[PDB]
Amino acid sequence: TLKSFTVEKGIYQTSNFRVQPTESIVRFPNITNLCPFHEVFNATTFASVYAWNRKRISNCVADYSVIYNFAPFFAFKCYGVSPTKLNDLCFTNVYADSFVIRGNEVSQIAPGQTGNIADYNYKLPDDFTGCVIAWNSNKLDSKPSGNYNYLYRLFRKSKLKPFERDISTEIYQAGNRPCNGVAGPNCYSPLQSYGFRPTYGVGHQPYRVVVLSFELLHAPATVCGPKKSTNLVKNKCVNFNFNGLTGTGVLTESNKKFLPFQQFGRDIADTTDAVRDPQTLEILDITPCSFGGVSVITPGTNTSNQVAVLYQGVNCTEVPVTGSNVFQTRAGCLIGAEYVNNSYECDIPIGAGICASYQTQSQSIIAYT
Amino acid sequence: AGCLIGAEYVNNSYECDIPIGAGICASYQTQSQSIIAYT
Amino acid sequence: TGVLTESNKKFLPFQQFGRDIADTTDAVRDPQTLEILDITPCSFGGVSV
Amino acid sequence: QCVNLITRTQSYTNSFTRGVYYPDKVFRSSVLHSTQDLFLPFFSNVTWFHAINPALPFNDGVYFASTEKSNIIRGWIFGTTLDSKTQSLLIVNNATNVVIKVCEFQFCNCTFEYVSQPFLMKNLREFVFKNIDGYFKIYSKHTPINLERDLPQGFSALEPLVDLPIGINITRFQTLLAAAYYVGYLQPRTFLLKYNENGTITDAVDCALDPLSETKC
Amino acid sequence: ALGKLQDVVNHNAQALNTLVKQLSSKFGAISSVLNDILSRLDKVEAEVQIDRLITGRLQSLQTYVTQQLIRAAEIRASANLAATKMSECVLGQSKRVDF
Amino acid sequence: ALGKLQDVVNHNAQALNTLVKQLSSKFGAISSVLNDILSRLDKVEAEVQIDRLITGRLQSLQTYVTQQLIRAAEIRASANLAATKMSECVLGQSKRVDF
Amino acid sequence: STECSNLLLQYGSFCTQLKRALTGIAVEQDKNTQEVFAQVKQIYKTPPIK
Amino acid sequence: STECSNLLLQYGSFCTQLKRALTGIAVEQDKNTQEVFAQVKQIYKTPPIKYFGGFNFSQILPDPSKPSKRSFIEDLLFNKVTLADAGFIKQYGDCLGDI
Amino acid sequence: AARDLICAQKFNGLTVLPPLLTDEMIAQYTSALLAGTITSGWTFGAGAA
Ligand SMILES: *[C@@H]1O[C@H](CO)[C@@H](O[C@@H]2O[C@H](CO)[C@@H](O)[C@H](O)[C@H]2NC(C)=O)[C@H](O)[C@H]1NC(C)=O
Ligand SMILES: *[C@@H]1O[C@H](CO)[C@@H](O)[C@H](O)[C@H]1NC(C)=O
Ligand SMILES: *[C@@H]1O[C@H](CO)[C@@H](O)[C@H](O)[C@H]1NC(C)=O
Ligand SMILES: *[C@@H]1O[C@H](CO)[C@@H](O)[C@H](O)[C@H]1NC(C)=O
Ligand SMILES: *[C@@H]1O[C@H](CO)[C@@H](O)[C@H](O)[C@H]1NC(C)=O
Ligand SMILES: *[C@@H]1O[C@H](CO)[C@@H](O)[C@H](O)[C@H]1NC(C)=O
Ligand SMILES: *[C@@H]1O[C@H](CO)[C@@H](O)[C@H](O)[C@H]1NC(C)=O
């Protein structure tokens, strides 16, 4: 710590001590159903971008590694998460939205993006946490005469809020002349059909898009993956994993009066203080494992190699293990220095009126007032 | 120091209770309970 | 955002903007008519209770 | 179908620091927490409606209140246009379940259905309806009211019952049916909430009411 | 009458409470919880968010240490004045006016 | 003769001038004007530049406040000396040599 | 700018403690002037005969 | 967190100099207290007779009944300043209580 | 036409607070001290003049 080979007389603050965890505990909800991701990615027809479906996925075990076998896509474009870690962490509700767009409009399916599709057909929130999947469908959603079954909206009196749908087809009024159900010179139909032909370029080819939206953790968790659970231990320093909330600490029964809609508890520094077990409805505190500071009391290296250790702020009942002498101090507790009834001038200050010195008793480190 | 709204000025001089600005202080007094400003 | 005021700043005919010490615009030229306008910030201040 | 609406008699009263809900599902104890959300402002102007009903606006969230011991009030209707054209919520209580439907009921295609547990049983019934990001949240609280006329003095935090993923547009609302109710409108406000040692919200401060509360915030 | 020592206690409490409350900030990251960042993202993106949190907490702790140094200098000047007053008022008789 | 009070004026004047002049720096962003950043880029691509400007201006404000605290400590020491000279040289007669 | 204010909210309490430090300096200046000059308790004035 | 420590190791010696500054402040506080109060070479004590020409000194001389030999005025000054315990006697042991 | 830097300081968040004691009050304090030490000596500092 001093980056030197000679140490002078005094007390020096070395590295801290920690108590290491014993085992790891995983706690996941008692859920055995399987999520129907196959019927989302394998359908005969997808809906248009103005009438996109929204499938609710809940109360099942989700395996996200089978999505790659279901559809031929390059990447798995996620915002707020990663495609690798989706099998470990878990949510409350999952939402799947499937539609068909053009190739130029795939970049508009993104948070904070505007355009035609983003303003009139499908808007994503700025705080979006979820994964967008897009793959080419020129072999299934195209015809040599031109596929006309996919439509999109061009005209609207305002923009669209995130996650809204527009179904009604009223004639747009672009001028001061009223339409009254007549598509005149200043009136146009708001829906226009996609033109999908196999001879078009790759930027105009149809693309099938599935967007998965995740609700992180506010409700009791219903969509959690295939990670197995472990029995709950208490009054021991262990690793814990509560519905994707990982950590290290000591769990114990609590007197916290949780209201029935509350599943977490936080501290002033925004860390989890109490948790509810997802299998049995009980409240557990989370206390970090025992720690403190370690100080080294020494004379000069040219004098002796003997040493005393002060564990500051730590009762020696909590100290696991270093000499044969143990003394209790208000500044911590002392190991390796014996206590005498005499009083001297202060040589090495420890604290709270306690000093230490090195002298003949042959020679040893003593502590005194 | 600017514009003071809610305290009415008096033509008296006491010790400073709440400092405001360039020689002006404010206080809370009995003679109805009210907030006054003074030099 | 600000208040536009008709100015007496002697803009050269090749100059379209006027800028400040703190890298902010003080005067602007109207694109449609050849007029120079001062841009001042709106009325602000501090409130003590 | 008929009409049978019995006019609408309006009056105005004061909110009296009412309409506070839990902003999240996180337990907090012995801490002052600042939250920016859609809150009913303190000492606001709320409207009292009597019926011994044209379309009311939905202005960024609705605080609803009822002091009806006789138990005639039973439901709410949401949406934009009450017909078989535009999507509209249909919260009806049958004293056992809450049926929630989006398309139409003709008021004597479909995307969502729901069923629930009974909401209800000298009492005050408070409700907060909120529509953010394709969701629809309902907060509620019952209170053993005394001093029958007007809203009481004090605090009562509104615990959430249901969060409903509807995903449609709301601009107008109606009420199912002597019958008197209070309507107020939420505003984007910053509040300073006080949690006691048991985790219950006891006091609050509205930071934009007066300079003293801004100083407190 | 004892407002100076009470201010000494209150400043030392308030700096530590500010340092504890500063840990809830995000500093531009996705979350202020470090394990949530490590659970949600893979290695490179979590390293980016971890670097943002590290820089923010390092700046906060440096600000705390600088304010502690300035306050320690002020307290040392006051202690030098108190030692001079112990030497001259108590151990002797002073002819200095208003000392 | 009155160089110290002129220096007291000039230090605060040049500190405020430097604090105003520090708003012209880009701090690695594409522009020093915030409205041009918001007008040129979309939200995701402009939040990085806004964060860079925020960090640079925050660091300049930290530097100004730290320098003001150090100068305030020096002025407090000089004011304590002036108060002692008011109490001893003016309100009495001093036997201290060259005080 | 509203977006800059929303991004500045994520940095915690730097702007409050800077304000606290400057407020302490501003109070200390008035304390310095009052400690130097306001030593007398009464406003003595000279007689007209000089 | 091991990953946070591994990325924190690349920022250099900021932690060591912050620790050095805090240790210097902590030693300087004890130096201040020693140079103010420890100005006498021998622990003098008053004779058991308590007549000093009619002067009393009962309120500033210590009371031997209390376990801490403080005077009445010293006990008043200790009671009035609401000084926190500041985690001296096993603060982790106090934090282990299920409260 | 000659732009003042104090306006650019004020427009960018930097304000200057006035002192509590004006120059007239400081001059009155100085006059009281000087009149006391002329007409009484050092007696006004230890008590009554
Ligand atoms: C010196 O002061 C002490 C404390 O003020 C005096 O002790 C008190 O004396 C009165 C009556 O003279 C008693 O009623 C009290 O009970 C005494 N104790 C206290 C704690 O007040 C003492 O009398 C004084 N000495 C002389 C010589 O008068
Ligand atoms: C899952 O396990 C927990 C813990 O034993 C139990 O309380 C719960 O009833 C179980 N759920 C089911 C559906 O069996
Ligand atoms: C979809 O399911 C059918 C039968 O259920 C199967 O034959 C087909 O290979 C699947 N995939 C696609 C892309 O159609
Ligand atoms: C240390 O541990 C003992 C035994 O658990 C306990 O009685 C005591 O209160 C603790 N603290 C101190 C300061 O001795
Ligand atoms: C609410 O507004 C109406 C509008 O005229 C007014 O008469 C009434 O006094 C207001 N209520 C208050 C201020 O409590
Ligand atoms: C949806 O609600 C918003 C309210 O801001 C309104 O402006 C818009 O016209 C509504 N759209 C439809 C289709 O009702
Ligand atoms: C908290 O709850 C306990 C037990 O329910 C009660 O005794 C105490 O008064 C409560 N504290 C409050 C309401 O502040």
Curated annotation (Swiss-Prot), chain C:
Upper taxonomic lineage: Viruses, Riboviria, Orthornavirae, Pisuviricota, Pisoniviricetes
Name of the protein this chain belongs to: Spike protein S1
Organism: Severe acute respiratory syndrome coronavirus 2
Function, in words: Attaches the virion to the cell membrane by interacting with host receptor, initiating the infection. The major receptor is host ACE2. When S2/S2' has been cleaved, binding to the receptor triggers direct fusion at the cell membrane. When S2/S2' has not been cleaved, binding to the receptor results in internalization of the virus by endocytosis using host TFRC and GRM2 and leading to fusion of the virion membrane with the host endosomal membrane. Alternatively, may use NRP1/NRP2 and integrin as entry receptors.
Protein origin, superkingdom: Viruses
Residues of the full protein shown: 549 to 597 of 1273
The gene coding this protein: S
Subunit organization: Binds to host ACE2. RBD also interacts with the N-linked glycan on 'Asn-90' of ACE2. Cleavage of S generates a polybasic C-terminal sequence on S1 that binds to host Neuropilin-1 (NRP1) and Neuropilin-2 (NRP2) receptors. Interacts with host integrin alpha-5/beta-1 (ITGA5:ITGB1) and with ACE2 in complex with integrin alpha-5/beta-1 (ITGA5:ITGB1). May interact via cytoplasmic c-terminus with M protein. May interact (via N-terminus) with host bilirubin and biliverdin, thereby preventing antibody binding to the SARS-CoV-2 spike NTD via an allosteric mechanism.
Swiss-Prot record, chain D:
Domain of life: Viruses
Disulfide bonds: C2-C108, C103-C110, C207-C217
Annotated effect of mutating N93Q: Partial loss of biliverdin affinity
Glycosylation positions in this chain: N4, N45, N94, N109, N169, N198
Putative superantigen: region residues: 196-217
Effect of R125S: In strain: Gamma/P.1
Effect of mutating T7N: In strain: Gamma/P.1
Annotated ranges, domain BetaCoV S1-NTD: 1-217
Subunit structure: Binds to host ACE2. RBD also interacts with the N-linked glycan on 'Asn-90' of ACE2. Cleavage of S generates a polybasic C-terminal sequence on S1 that binds to host Neuropilin-1 (NRP1) and Neuropilin-2 (NRP2) receptors. Interacts with host integrin alpha-5/beta-1 (ITGA5:ITGB1) and with ACE2 in complex with integrin alpha-5/beta-1 (ITGA5:ITGB1). May interact via cytoplasmic c-terminus with M protein. May interact (via N-terminus) with host bilirubin and biliverdin, thereby preventing antibody binding to the SARS-CoV-2 spike NTD via an allosteric mechanism.
Function per UniProt: Attaches the virion to the cell membrane by interacting with host receptor, initiating the infection. The major receptor is host ACE2. When S2/S2' has been cleaved, binding to the receptor triggers direct fusion at the cell membrane. When S2/S2' has not been cleaved, binding to the receptor results in internalization of the virus by endocytosis using host TFRC and GRM2 and leading to fusion of the virion membrane with the host endosomal membrane. Alternatively, may use NRP1/NRP2 and integrin as entry receptors.
Name under which the protein is recorded: Spike protein S1
